[PDB]
């Protein structure tokens, strides 16, 4: 036994590496948490109402009630994530103290700060943030984000924006990979990203943290596509519980992300899945 260190970058960035190849599901109850866990979800996201309802309802979307989060924390053994309004330091402090495994400073909730985000370095618990391109993915990381999720349109059942952005990020990464330093510094100005992180992307040939696809995934095929486009995994909220047979759909999602390059299997898990959410377009 010797000196131990907690909440360091290697631990935060590392924790997220464990999620690769998996599916993170939004859950509203302890019952859903269990379905999600039985299905093979790698983690659940605690919410009062899924993205699709957040849209339908309206009003100010804030942090979930502690009660609701404890409910879910006690219902499964897999990590539990909770969303907080952008820039809401207080909500995040509360959540960290509650012991949540991963905070999500998401935009599906009514933003608290209109310009700045939470300075995530101050925290011990890892954060995951959204991005529509390499520029903000990189900015979010500069603020401390240990995991990025390329967002689309929450709760619409349409992968189009997710595709758009996943392609965008991947495209830029690829380009940056072949830029000369002087081009890197210039590009940094263009897309408004820190040159230090660009140099990092250039060497790793990828983002310096795990990147998940999110927003609009409503069917196994959608999940597989996201992986075909280069995602490390997917976040599915409305697409599972807003369908006819959630447990059925859920097991299929988990298998599509794993066997995205296996048509035989993709077809097998698609033979029957129920009726995907109708979606908004």
């Amino acid at each position: 036994h010797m000196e131990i260190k907690k909440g360091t970058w290697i631990i935060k960035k590392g924790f997220a590496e464990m999620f690769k190849g998996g599916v993170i599901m939004d859950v509203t109850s302890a019952e859903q948490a269990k379905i999600a866990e039985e299905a093979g979800a790698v983690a659940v996201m605690a919410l009062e109402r899924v993205p699709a309802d957040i849209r339908k309802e309206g009003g100010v979307a804030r942090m979930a009630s502690i009660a609701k989060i404890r409910e879910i924390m006690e219902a499964v053994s897999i990590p539990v994530m909770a969303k907080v309004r952008i820039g809401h330091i207080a909500e995040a402090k509360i959540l960290e103290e509650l012991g949540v495994d991963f905070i999500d400073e998401s935009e599906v909730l009514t933003p608290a700060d209109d310009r700045f985000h939470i300075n995530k370095h101050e925290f011990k618990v890892p954060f995951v943030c959204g991005a529509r391109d390499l520029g903000e993915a990189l900015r979010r990381i500069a603020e401390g984000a240990a995991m990025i999720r390329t967002k689309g349109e929450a709760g619409t059942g349409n992968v189009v924006e997710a595709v758009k952005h996943m392609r965008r990020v991947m495209e830029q990464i690829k380009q940056v990979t072949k830029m000369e330093d002087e081009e890197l510094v210039a590009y940094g100005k263009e897309i408004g990203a820190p040159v230090e992180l660009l140099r990092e992307v250039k060497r790793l040939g990828r983002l310096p943290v795990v990147n998940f696809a999110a927003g609009g995934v409503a069917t196994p095929a959608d999940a597989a596509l996201m992986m075909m486009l280069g995602a490390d995994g997917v976040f599915v909220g409305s697409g599972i519980f807003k369908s006819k047979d959630p447990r059925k759909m859920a097991k299929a999602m988990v298998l599509a992300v794993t066997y995205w390059d296996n048509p035989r299997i993709l077809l097998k898990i698609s033979e029957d899945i129920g009726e995907p959410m109708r979606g908004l377009d």
Binding site: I4, K6, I10, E17, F19, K20, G22, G40, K124, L255
Partner: protein
């Protein structure tokens, strides 16, 4: 040359594959049953044990993985892998490693820590152990050899051709524990 497999149903498959490549061995990501018969060694990576076992069963790979191991296939498990192999858990499992494990034994993710541990078998220089929502080995069996411990708990065991630890060596640049595994092939 030898071909080592990395079970890839879910988990940090890249981290391990990259370690093996640094050691110059050829690798194969194992997703289908028929691929278990194509490797000299198998690494059960970190990730979600509940996920791994589910996929493993839904794809009819579990029973064959167990057989294959009992027939002496060299296996290296990190965190989730240990829970997967364990015979007793204080949840479905492969049940081949004669030990009893306690999941999330240190608490939530905020409890995750990194400390230096001494693994005599691989050198005098301590090893950087990164425990993330790690499990605890509360009881080791008869043939279970203990290669290293941290605060009264076995963190690296060896029983037969199986090598299991509760931390993540693949997250560090220390290839020592990976060599020791290849040495078992």
């Amino acid at each position: 040359h030898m071909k080592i497999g990395v079970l890839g149903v879910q988990g940090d498959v890249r981290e391990h594959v990259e370690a093996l490549h640094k050691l110059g061995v050829e690798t194969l990501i194992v997703k289908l049953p028929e691929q278990l018969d194509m490797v000299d060694g198998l690494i059960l990576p970190g990730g979600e044990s509940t996920t791994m076992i589910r996929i493993l069963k839904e794809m009819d790979m579990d029973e064959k993985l167990v057989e294959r191991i009992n027939n002496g296939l060299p296996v290296f498990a990190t965190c989730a892998g240990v829970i997967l192999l364990a015979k007793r858990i204080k949840q479905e499992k492969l049940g081949v490693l004669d030990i009893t494990v306690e999941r999330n034994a240190y608490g939530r993710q905020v409890e995750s820590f990194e400390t230096f541990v001494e693994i005599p078998a691989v050198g005098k220089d301590p090893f950087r152990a990164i425990f993330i929502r790690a499990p605890r080995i509360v009881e080791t069996g008869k043939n279970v050899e203990i290669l290293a411990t941290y605060d009264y708990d076995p963190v690296l065991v060896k029983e037969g051709n199986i090598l299991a630890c509760t931390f993540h060596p693949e997250l560090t640049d220390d290839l020592r524990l990976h060599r020791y595994f290849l040495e078992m092939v």
